[PDB]
Amino acid sequence: SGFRKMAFPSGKVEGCMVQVTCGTTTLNGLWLDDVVYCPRHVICTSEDMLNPNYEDLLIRKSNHNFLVQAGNVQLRVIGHSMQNCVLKLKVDTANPKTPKYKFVRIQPGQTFSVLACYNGSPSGVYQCAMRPNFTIKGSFLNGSCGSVGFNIDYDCVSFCYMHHMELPTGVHAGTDLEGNFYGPFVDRQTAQAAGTDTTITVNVLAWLYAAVINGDRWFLNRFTTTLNDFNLVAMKYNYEPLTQDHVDILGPLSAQTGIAVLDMCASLKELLQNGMNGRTILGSALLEDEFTPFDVVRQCSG
Amino acid sequence: SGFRKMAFPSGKVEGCMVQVTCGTTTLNGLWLDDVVYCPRHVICTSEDMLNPNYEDLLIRKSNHNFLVQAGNVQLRVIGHSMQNCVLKLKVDTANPKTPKYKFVRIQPGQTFSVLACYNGSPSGVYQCAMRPNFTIKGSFLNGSCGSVGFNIDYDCVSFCYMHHMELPTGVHAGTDLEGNFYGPFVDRQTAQAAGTDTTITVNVLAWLYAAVINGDRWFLNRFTTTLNDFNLVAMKYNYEPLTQDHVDILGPLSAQTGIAVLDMCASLKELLQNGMNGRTILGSALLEDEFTPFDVVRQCSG
Ligand SMILES: O=Cc1cc2ccccc2[nH]1
Ligand SMILES: O=Cc1cc2ccccc2[nH]1
Numbered sequence: 128s129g130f131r132k133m134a135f136p137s138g139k140v141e142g143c144m145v146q147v148t149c150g151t152t153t154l155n156g157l158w159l160d161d162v163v164y165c166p167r168h169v170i171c172t173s174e175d176m177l178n179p180n181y182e183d184l185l186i187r188k189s190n191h192n193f194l195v196q197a198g199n200v201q202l203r204v205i206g207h208s209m210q211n212c213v214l215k216l217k218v219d220t221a222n223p224k225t226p227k228y229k230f231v232r233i234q235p236g237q238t239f240s241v242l243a244c245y246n247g248s249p250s251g252v253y254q255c256a257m258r259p260n261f262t263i264k265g266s267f268l269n270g271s272c273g274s275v276g277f278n279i280d281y282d283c284v285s286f287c288y289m290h291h292m293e294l295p296t297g298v299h300a301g302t303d304l305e306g307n308f309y310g311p312f313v314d315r316q317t318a319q320a321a322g323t324d325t326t327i328t329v330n331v332l333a334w335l336y337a338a339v340i341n342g343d344r345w346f347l348n349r350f351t352t353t354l355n356d357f358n359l360v361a362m363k364y365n366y367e368p369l370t371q372d373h374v375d376i377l378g379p380l381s382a383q384t385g386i387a388v389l390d391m392c393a394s395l396k397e398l399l400q401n402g403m404n405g406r407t408i409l410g411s412a413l414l415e416d417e418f419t420p421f422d423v424v425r426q427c428s429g
Numbered sequence: 430s431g432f433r434k435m436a437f438p439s440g441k442v443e444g445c446m447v448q449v450t451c452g453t454t455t456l457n458g459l460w461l462d463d464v465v466y467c468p469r470h471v472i473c474t475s476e477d478m479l480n481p482n483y484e485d486l487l488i489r490k491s492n493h494n495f496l497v498q499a500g501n502v503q504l505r506v507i508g509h510s511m512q513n514c515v516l517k518l519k520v521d522t523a524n525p526k527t528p529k530y531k532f533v534r535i536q537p538g539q540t541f542s543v544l545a546c547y548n549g550s551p552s553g554v555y556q557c558a559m560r561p562n563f564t565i566k567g568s569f570l571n572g573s574c575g576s577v578g579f580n581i582d583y584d585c586v587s588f589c590y591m592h593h594m595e596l597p598t599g600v601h602a603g604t605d606l607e608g609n610f611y612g613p614f615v616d617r618q619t620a621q622a623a624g625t626d627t628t629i630t631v632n633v634l635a636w637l638y639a640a641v642i643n644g645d646r647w648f649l650n651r652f653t654t655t656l657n658d659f660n661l662v663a664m665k666y667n668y669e670p671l672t673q674d675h676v677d678i679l680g681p682l683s684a685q686t687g688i689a690v691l692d693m694c695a696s697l698k699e700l701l702q703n704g705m706n707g708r709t710i711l712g713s714a715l716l717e718d719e720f721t722p723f724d725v726v727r728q729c730s731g
Contacts, residue, residue: 128599131568133553136544138440242438245731251435252554264712266433268731297430297644342599410566412714429547429570 128341130409132417133426134240134254135279142224145202146247147216147273148194155244155273156195156216157286157304159225163195163202163216164304165273166291167209168314176316185209196247197222211306212314213289226284230304233287235259236327236367238419239276241288243267256330256417259367260322261310262298263288275304294321326416328366329373332391333420336380338408340427345406347386352393364399376420383428430643432711434719435728436542436556437581444526447504448549449518449575450496457546457575458497458518459588459606461527465497465504465518466606467575468593469511470616478618487511498549499524513608514616515591528586532606535589537561538629538669540721541578543590545569558632558719561669562624563612564600565590577606596623628718630668631675634693635722638682640710642729647708649688654695666701678722685730 147156147165151172156165170184188207193216195202206217233239238256242249243266255263255276267274267290276288290301291314298321300312312319339347358368374388381388395414403412449458449467453474458467472486490509495518497504508519535541540558544551545568557565557578569576569592578590592603593616600623602614614621641649660670676690683690697716705714 128595129566129568129601131555131557132434133545133555133568134436136439136443136551136554138438138443138551141438141440243435249438249440250731251728252438253433253435255433264431266431266435266728268729270731293430299431407715413709426553426568427570429552429572 130337130341130426132254134252135277137240137242137249137252139226139279139282139284140242140275140277141249143222143226144242144244144247144249144275146196148196149188149192153246154270155247155275157273157275157289158195158197158202158218158222159228161218161221163204163218164289165214165216166289166302166314167212167214167306168272168291169193169214178315178317181209185214198247209306212291212302212308213304213306227282228284228286231278231285231287232303232305232307233257235261236330236419238417238422239278239287241265241276241290242274243271244274245270254417256327257288257309258298258324259327260324261312262294262300262321262324265290265299267293267299276301294319296321323365326364326366326414328361328369328416329376329420330416330418331366331414332369332373332377332388332395333380333423334409334415334418335391335395336377336384336386336420337418337423337427339384339386340380340423341409343408346398346403346408347391347394348397350393350397351387351390352396354389354392357389357392357396360396360399366399379424380420432639432643432728434556436554437579439542439544439551439554441528441581441584441586442544442577442579443551445524445528446544446546446549446551446577448498450498451490451494455548456572457549457577459575459577459591460497460499460504460520460524461530463520463523465506465520466591467516467518468591468604468616469514469516469608470574470593471495471516480617480619483511487516500549511608514593514604514610515606515608529584530586530588533580533587533589534605534607534609535559537563538632538721540719540724541580541589543567543578543592544576545573546576547572556719558629559590559611560600560626561629562626563610563614564596564602564623564626567592567601569595569601578603596621598623625667628666628668628716630663630671630718631678631722632718632720633668633716634671634675634679634690634697635682635725636711636717636720637693637697638679638686638688638722639720639725639729641686641688642682642725643711645710648700648705648710649693649696650699652695652699653689653692654698656691656694659691659694659698662698662701668701681726682722
């Protein structure tokens with residue numbers, strides 16, 4: 128029993144983190160096969176930060192201008208190119224620790240593990256979710272550019288996120304591993320507002336199912352509700368609408384607990400309208416929305 | 430910015446996890462140099478669970494009765510011995526991935542990362558703390574026996590915990606890597622009460638300092654307090670007493686924020702007596718006590 132915000136084991140990703148320096152800027156890079164991936168921020172300086180001319184900055188760079196270090200081992204760059212917001216540095220040595228991997232672009236509401244790195248050295252690992260406004264509420268310091276997010280599916284690493292910048296509000300924005308930003312963000316030092324964030328409804332319902340599985344049952348009421356009636360209440364409290372796709376994905380949890388999805392919606396409906404009255408669910412006084420239905424099944428039943 | 434319950438990178442520990450089977454029981458093991466460490470629970474069956482005679486059970490075992498598998502590789506056992514509650518299985522092959530390591534016994538209030546493993550395969554990693562009653566609030570399923578807790582200090586893995594059992598209350602108990610249980614627990618299937626748990630005061634204060642560093646300042650009041658007056662209030666709300674050793678360890682955070690430790694105590698004093706009024710600190714509606722002063726410095730300033 129028990130329930131934690133667990134992250135995937137990071138060993139397969141640790142063996143791929145390198146340090147990338149071009150001129151005077153240093154950040155993290157991802158070394159897969161004979162290619163190092165890193166944000167194109169590495170070819171910038173302070174002066175150009177308001178609106179960098181990335182093409183002109185890269186035209187003036189040679190392969191030798193890129194210093195790539197795997198631990199204490201210098202990798203020789205034998206070619207370079209830019210794809211959207213990331214650079215591909217071709218090196219003469221293939222990473223012997225390359226895991227089976229895929230590049231994926233995730234949807235809002237899905238979760239992934241973040242390996243926070245500095246100077247190519249992993250510092251820590253944590254679990255987070257892609258918010259509906261395409262930001263993440265991570266923990267990054269200066270020098271964390273190039274840190275990657277990922278999921279692990281039975282020895283296959285699915286890379287989904289590379290870290291770029293921190294917004295004035297304290298949230299974070301990044302790209303997929305093909306260089307495209309999640310959300311309407313650009314790698315320039317200009318004020319960029321994130322959209323209004325909402326709560327991931329299907330994740331809260333999955334988290335309530337995990338509570339029932341681990342013995343927290345006080346919030347379950349005796350009522351049911353329709354899908355339309357539930358979505359009307361969810362709209363008032365800034366929750367995402369619940370779709371039949373979401374009801375379908377909650378099926379296995381419903382079968383394990385015997386609680387129909389619309390019955391759990393009736394219980395969430397009361398929680399939204401009346402609050403917790405100082406009580407907690409799985410050790411939290413707030414409703415958690417960073418556990419997918421898949422995350423709940425994995426932790427509650429391997 | 431941002432603040433997460435971060436765990437250490439697990440790669441150095443993943444390379445040491447093996448599967449240990451003796452007879453019909455299977456659990457996890459820790460493979461360091463030419464020795465595999467695992468709970469002595471592996472030589473038990475259902476019948477003997479109420480009060481296992483561990484010495485008699487081990488006397489009837491040969492080296493060949495122990496099946497140790499590192500991935501798909503079978504390790505040959507060439508010797509065995511029992512030290513307290515763990516077994517040492519000497520194998521003919523040294524683990525080529527053995528990191529620099531130490532065996533440590535931690536104190537209550539200190540934190541460590543847990544690598545949850547099943548059949549010798551890491552499943553996830555999370556951060557937790559040794560409670561004052563010597564339990565941990567982890568997340569384990571059946572088959573998690575032998576999972577280890579650890580800290581990483583610049584390439585040196587300090588192993589501090591090996592998982593054994595789950596109490597009827599849903600909390601977890603284990604041993605150090607020399608086989609001695611944390612707290613008054615025995616590896617038998619008998620009802621064993623944990624002592625009344627308390628809140629780790631110095632960790633809450635460190636977590637409040639992390640809030641100030643990341644911009645949450647609403648709880649800071651205009652008052653100060655003495656150490657004796659603070660401990661009187663902390664006693665009423667089941668908080669550990671604050672010692673001068675704790676005041677000393679909070680020094681660096683006080684210097685960074687300019688807030689004297691006794692001033693932050695005055696602010697915690699008001700929070701304990703009046704509550705949060707529905708507001709949150711670092712995204713939580715409860716006071717968190719699983720971040721040490723060392724954890725806060727690492728995440729807020731690498
Ligand atoms: O990857 C690092 C990085 C990208 C970026 C864009 C704007 C401002 C700071 C930034 N850092
Ligand atoms: O390590 C696994 C393990 C030890 C133990 C003791 C009592 C009951 C169950 C147990 N599992």
